Amino acid sequence: ACVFFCEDAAXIGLAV
Amino acid sequence: ACVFFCEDAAXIGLAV
Amino acid sequence: ACVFFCEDAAXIGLAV
Amino acid sequence: ACVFFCEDAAXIGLAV
Amino acid sequence: ACVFFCEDAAXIGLAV
Amino acid sequence: ACVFFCEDAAXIGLAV
Amino acid sequence: ACVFFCEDAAXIGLAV
Amino acid sequence: ACVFFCEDAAXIGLAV
Amino acid sequence: ACVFFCEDAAXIGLAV
Amino acid sequence: ACVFFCEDAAXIGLAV
Amino acid sequence: ACVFFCEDAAXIGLAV
Amino acid sequence: ACVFFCEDAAXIGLAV
User: Which among B4, C12, G4, L1 would be 20 to 30 A from D14, CA to CA?
Assistant: First the structure.
């Protein structure tokens, strides 16, 4: 999978 | 966040 | 390029 | 939450 | 009228 | 996998 | 806006 | 939104 | 202390 | 975090 | 001076 | 605190 850096607030690494 | 369209199988929107 | 659908608030398409 | 397509003009997604 | 999906940046629905 | 809408020209559903 | 990296615990990006 | 790293030659962050 | 990037899920910095 | 003072028109404290 | 990552569009290293 | 990226010359992270 890959890590995306997205604002969820905070910006975190989401693994997809 | 972004919406990804991915297999979970069925295809769904994913909140990224 | 690709079209992504992400929240910026509103949900919009983005050209990548 | 749900996404609705609404006028803001332009048509955009609103997250509610 | 009709909705067109165009990049204005963001891609949004424009009513014509 | 996921499906992204990308120009290949035509815009198509790219499978990845 | 800018991205700041700050501790909130975790270190996260913040949109400013 | 998500932050992508893309070339525009000149590698930049992209607000998606 | 040091900052490590770890799963909490999301990927975040941890201060140790 | 740091406290910033930013407008969102409406000047507020921001938790960064 | 310091370098901040800010959208100018692209995200770039702003020198201040 | 926040991490700033600043000249000390070399560039370093600063704990703010």
Answer: G4
